[PDB]
Every structure is written in structure tokens, then in C-alpha cells.
């Protein structure tokens, strides 16, 4: 299983490498006009600061999701022990009235 896992990793790297080489072959036509040039970085300052605020929002969203999932987990275990207590109480009550 360890040898086959190593073979699967090796196959994944070989596939990724073959795909990188296919991309170069498809992009040979794009390389042909590499002598061309145009305008760039006109409004880059606000675009970069807004991209940084967006990365802060995505990282905060990731933290928010982690805190959400762990809370759903503890809440589920709390609801589960509460349901176990409810049934134990109800059955003990049914047994007291039966007695």
C-alpha cells in the first residue's frame, strides 16, 4: 500500500509535468509575438490595497468558517448528550409510574 501510494504520487507528478509541457506546446504561437508591448500599472495602487483587504476578508472568512464548524460540532455533541438525558429521564419516569 505504501509502494502503491508512492507510485500514485509519482504518477500525479508525471501527469502534472506532462501537462506543463503540453501548455508550452500550445503557447508557442503566443511566444511568436513576444516583441509586442503595451501600457500597464496605471491604477495599481488602489487595486493592490483593495486586493490586500480582500485577502484579509478571505483569511477572516476562513477563520469564521473554522469557528463555525467547531461550534456546530460541540453544539451537536451537547444536543446528543441532552437527547440521551431526555430519553433516560422519560424512561425512568415511565418506569416510576409503572412501579
Amino acid at each position: 500500500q505504501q509502494d502503491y501510494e508512492t507510485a500514485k504520487h509519482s504518477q500525479h507528478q508525471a501527469k502534472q509535468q506532462a501537462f506543463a509541457l503540453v501548455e508550452i506546446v500550445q503557447r508557442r504561437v503566443h511566444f511568436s509575438y513576444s516583441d509586442s508591448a503595451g501600457m500597464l500599472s496605471e491604477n495599481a495602487d488602489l487595486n493592490d490595497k483593495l486586493r490586500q483587504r480582500l485577502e484579509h476578508a478571505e483569511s477572516d472568512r476562513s477563520r469564521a468558517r473554522e469557528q463555525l464548524r467547531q461550534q456546530q460540532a460541540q453544539y451537536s455533541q451537547f444536543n446528543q448528550v441532552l437527547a440521551s438525558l431526555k430519553s433516560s429521564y422519560e424512561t425512568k419516569q415511565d418506569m416510576l409510574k409503572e412501579l
Binding site: 509541457l21 496605471e42 472568512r61 412501579l99
Partner: protein, 148 residues
Amino acid sequence: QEKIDRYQVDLEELSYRLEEQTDVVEEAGELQAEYEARTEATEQEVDELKSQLADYQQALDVQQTRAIQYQQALQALERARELCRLPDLSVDNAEEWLETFQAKEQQATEALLALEQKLSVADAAHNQFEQAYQLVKNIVGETSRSEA
């Protein structure tokens, strides 16, 4: 009479345990709902920032002029220079490298399948061995595989 009294005391204790768990579940439910509204608000904030970024760049990136397009070919080639152990890799000799790496990829699939045949018979043989071991443990209890 004493049994009915003990069951009443057990019901009182279970009521106290129920009160404690209901309080814990209500607090946990409030925290769960607050974290849901907050998380949805974080995705809404992320989407608002993405939409405002799109609206701000509209006039900047539309006039691309097909001149900033070849850098992607350069980046693809550079990505391949780190991923593939070929520092001399050129768009010209990349066809010989492509067929050479495709040969390694098919060899890797053939080796993977060759290992998979033996792996499948070995995994199923271990599953029957474990079934025989579980059957012995259910009938007598803990014992070694040598004694099975």
C-alpha cells in the same frame, strides 16, 4: 416503597443534569447562530470586496491590446522549468521533452496498475484474515493470530 423513592431521587438528579445540558445547548445554539450570521457576513464582505474590485478595474483591464498575452507563455515555461528538472527547457525542444515525459507518465500508470493487482488480492486476503479473527474473537475473546 424505597425503590419508588430512589427512582424519584434519580429523576431529580436527571432533571438537574437536564437543566445543566439545556443551558449548555441554548448557549451553544446562540453561539452557533451568531457564528452562522457572522460567517455568512464574512462571505458577503468577501463578495462585496470582489464585486467592488471588478467594478473599479473595468476601464483598466478591458483594453488588453494582445500585447500583455505572451507573458503567460513565459510564466508557463518558467513554471515548467521549476516543475520539470530541465534548466535548459526551451519552447523549441519542449516537444522532445513532452514525448519523453509522456513516456514516463504511461510507465508510471503501468507500474501503478501492476502494483494495484497484487495490492487488491493482498487487501482482500487481509479482509478475510480479519473476518476469521473477528469470528474467533466473538466466539472465545482475545487470542493471538498464531492461536487462531
